[PDB]
Amino acid sequence: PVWKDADTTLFCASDAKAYETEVHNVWATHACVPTDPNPQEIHLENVTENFNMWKNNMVEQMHEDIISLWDQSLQPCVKLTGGSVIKQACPKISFDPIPIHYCTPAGYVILKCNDKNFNGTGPCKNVSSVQCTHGIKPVVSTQLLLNGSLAEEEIIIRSENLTNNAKTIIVHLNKSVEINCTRPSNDIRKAYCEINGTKWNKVLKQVTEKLKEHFNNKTIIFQPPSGGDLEITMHTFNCRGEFFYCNTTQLFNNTCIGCNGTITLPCKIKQIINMWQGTGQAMYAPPIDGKINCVSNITGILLTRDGGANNTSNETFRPGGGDMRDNWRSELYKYKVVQIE
Ligand SMILES: CN1CCN(C(=O)N2C[C@H](CO)C[C@H](C(=O)Nc3ccc(Cl)c(F)c3)C2)CC1
Ligand SMILES: *[C@@H]1O[C@H](CO)[C@@H](O)[C@H](O)[C@H]1NC(C)=O
Ligand SMILES: *[C@@H]1O[C@H](CO)[C@@H](O)[C@H](O)[C@H]1NC(C)=O
Ligand SMILES: *[C@@H]1O[C@H](CO)[C@@H](O)[C@H](O)[C@H]1NC(C)=O
Ligand SMILES: *[C@@H]1O[C@H](CO)[C@@H](O)[C@H](O)[C@H]1NC(C)=O
Ligand SMILES: *[C@@H]1O[C@H](CO)[C@@H](O)[C@H](O)[C@H]1NC(C)=O
Ligand SMILES: *[C@@H]1O[C@H](CO)[C@@H](O)[C@H](O)[C@H]1NC(C)=O
Ligand SMILES: *[C@@H]1O[C@H](CO)[C@@H](O)[C@H](O)[C@H]1NC(C)=O
Ligand SMILES: *[C@@H]1O[C@H](CO)[C@@H](O)[C@H](O)[C@H]1NC(C)=O
Ligand SMILES: *[C@@H]1O[C@H](CO)[C@@H](O)[C@H](O)[C@H]1NC(C)=O
Ligand SMILES: *[C@@H]1O[C@H](CO)[C@@H](O)[C@H](O)[C@H]1NC(C)=O
Ligand SMILES: *[C@@H]1O[C@H](CO)[C@@H](O)[C@H](O)[C@H]1NC(C)=O
Ligand SMILES: *[C@@H]1O[C@H](CO)[C@@H](O)[C@H](O)[C@H]1NC(C)=O
């Protein structure tokens, strides 16, 4: 029972159904193995281990997987890409992510931090050892993290360096907030998201208080993004194959901390997309017929702190996103691959 930090090629596992035509099920059918039937972790009594969620190769390996999955499934009619115009089919596919597990080969094990207040960086006291991670839904989105896990007690603030304003902050919520997005049946690209306002604003209240704990009680100010290409300025996600862009100004600007009802965010289903996998534009086909609906859980927030506010008494935070590696980070944060012996 000796180990050291190391990186190896992992393998993936999932409860995919071989009959299902959903693209995540197909990709996991040919690319992952069945999940462990009898998994079990080994408690490491009075062992303290150092983790770093911002420098973890697991994240890059999952990222490479999700790039491959999307490359094979969600494929665009036209892909303007650094001067090329690769054209191809874009059949309306079935899209709904399933949990994926990340497993070590023989000779390696993953270490899992069970400290219920772990912030992703430095020491962990209650350390367990596993062979596979839990099932992680690979939900691509900006500004808001959806379908995710929740912090087990206090709202957790994750960052590689909180005093460096350039490094993204991940708010890990301890209570989810439902966001219910609909494109009603047949402007066929107009859509909207509904969110409970009292819930959302109570949770933003709590986030404010946490950030106060992290910033010497400086005043905390929320604002929408300041410049961006649309995938950043708007909450962008995929609903049954369609790319939704949603204005979140009503979430990051009324402050509202007589306002307490149901927030309705306007949204558009875009066709031309700035891809998150790599630089380039992808053009898909117009939306499917019928009502397109997704009821997701908001479980985390991607935030960028404003710079140059050192000599002021405020700290400004704006929703961020773009690098999906942080999206996988928000779930992989408690894991670490150690080579055995
Ligand atoms: C570092 N690496 C280089 C290439 N890259 C980009 O260039 N961008 C820039 C682009 C606009 O500027 C926005 C991109 C983005 O997040 N797109 C996106 C597409 C679909 C969905 Cl559903 C979504 F949630 C997000 C990020 C990724 C990061
Ligand atoms: C450590 O985490 C494990 C995982 O659930 C569990 O035994 C318990 O929460 C913790 N154990 C102790 C002794 O605190
Ligand atoms: C949303 O959150 C609720 C309560 O936090 C949970 O029971 C439910 O499973 C979550 N939904 C999804 C799709 O994870
Ligand atoms: C969430 O964490 C906050 C601390 O930021 C705490 O005050 C609150 O009671 C927690 N709520 C839930 C539902 O866990
Ligand atoms: C994370 O926790 C460690 C140890 O408690 C601490 O050194 C580090 O500053 C923390 N980071 C954040 C962003 O709270
Ligand atoms: C965090 O950011 C500040 C500001 O840029 C920098 O001075 C400091 O060295 C950073 N921390 C580390 C550990 O590099
Ligand atoms: C979501 O929104 C639609 C349209 O407003 C509504 O019919 C539905 O009841 C809402 N809730 C759920 C869980 O779908
Ligand atoms: C919103 O959730 C809050 C709980 O904080 C509750 O008071 C209310 O029932 C919900 N509002 C609606 C319109 O469902
Ligand atoms: C922040 O303000 C609270 C007031 O409730 C105080 O107890 C706490 O010491 C303050 N912390 C810092 C770091 O200023
Ligand atoms: C979001 O809506 C507000 C008005 O409610 C508008 O001022 C803002 O420009 C919109 N955001 C974008 C990115 O268009
Ligand atoms: C919200 O901030 C935006 C700046 O992007 C601006 O459109 C608006 O004035 C602010 N909110 C209100 C209620 O004015
Ligand atoms: C969140 O989970 C629900 C329940 O499976 C799902 O219907 C929804 O599409 C998910 N959200 C996203 C953005 O995938
Ligand atoms: C702002 O303050 C942080 C830490 O106090 C420092 O690292 C950073 O360089 C400062 N930025 C400027 C522009 O002075």
From TrEMBL:
One Gene Ontology cellular component annotation held by this UniProt entry: virion membrane
Keyword Cytoplasm: no
List of glycosylated residues: 46, 119, 126, 147, 161, 174, 180, 196, 217, 247, 253, 260, 297, 310
Human immunodeficiency virus 1 envelope glycoprotein Gp120 domain mapped to chain residues: 2-81, 84-341
Parts forming coiled coils: none
Keywords: Disulfide bond, Fusion of virus membrane with host membrane, Glycoprotein, Host-virus interaction, Membrane, Viral attachment to host cell, Viral penetration into host cytoplasm, Virion, Virus entry into host cell
Secretion signal, residue range per the UniProt entry: none
Keyword Protease in record: no
Natural source organism: Human immunodeficiency virus type 1
A Gene Ontology biological process term: virion attachment to host cell
Protein name as annotated: clade A/E 93TH057 HIV-1 gp120 core
Domain of life from the UniProt record: Viruses
InterPro entries tied to this protein: Gp120_core_sf (IPR036377), HIV1_Gp120 (IPR000777)
Cysteine pairings via disulfide bonds: 12-32, 77-90, 103-132, 113-124, 181-193, 239-294, 246-267, 256-259
Gene3D superfamilies: Human immunodeficiency virus 1, Gp160, envelope glycoprotein
Pfam families found in the cross-reference section: GP120
Location in the cell: Virion membrane
